Amino acid sequence: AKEVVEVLVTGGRATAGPPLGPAIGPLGVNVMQVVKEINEKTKDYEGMQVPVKVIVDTETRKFEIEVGIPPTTALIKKELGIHEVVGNLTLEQVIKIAKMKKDAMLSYTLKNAVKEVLGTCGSMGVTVEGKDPKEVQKEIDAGVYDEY
Numbered sequence: 001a002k003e004v005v006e007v008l009v010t011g012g013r014a015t016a017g018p019p020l021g022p023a024i025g026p027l028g029v030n031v032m033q034v035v036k037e038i039n040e041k042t043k044d045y046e047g048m049q050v051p052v053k054v055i056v057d058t059e060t061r062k063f064e065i066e067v068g069i070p071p072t073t074a075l076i077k078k079e080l081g082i083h084e085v086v087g088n089l090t091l092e093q094v095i096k097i098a099k100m101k102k103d104a105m106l107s108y109t110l111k112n113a114v115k116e117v118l119g120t121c122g123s124m125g126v127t128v129e130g131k132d133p134k135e136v137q138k139e140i141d142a143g144v145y146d147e148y
């Protein structure tokens with residue numbers, strides 16, 4: 001058989017936990033090799049949400065990795081190197097946009113996609129619920145909502 005896995009990892013900090021482990025361990029290929037190769041090819045996207053595709057032949061266990069690109073927002077920050085508010089969105093609006101992203105690209109978990117929307121809002125100086133989107137992300141990252 002062949003299996004194609006499409007996931008979103010943190011550029012240069014992929015681990016063998018989830019989601020690579022769940023998705024790949026089954027296919028019985030060395031998850032650590034996969035993780036090494038992915039971290040190699042996402043060096044330049046250190047810390048960014050990067051889409052990745054792994055293509056595996058289950059019989060043979062051979063695989064190959066194809067890397068997408070991060071959001072343009074993230075590429076711009078990076079290029080700028082080394083604080084103003086200009087609009088606000090509700091969290092339900094954030095979920096709306098995140099649902100469109102995920103419909104169009106199923107490799108996104110709703111969590112992933114909210115993450116990215118939150119990230120883009122930061123990059124635009126837009127608060128979510130009057131709050132800083134890094135703030136609001138922590139609230140989510142703890143496990144505190146599932147009710148919006």
Ligand SMILES: [Cl-]
Pocket residue numbers: 103104105106107
């Ligand atoms: Cl899709």
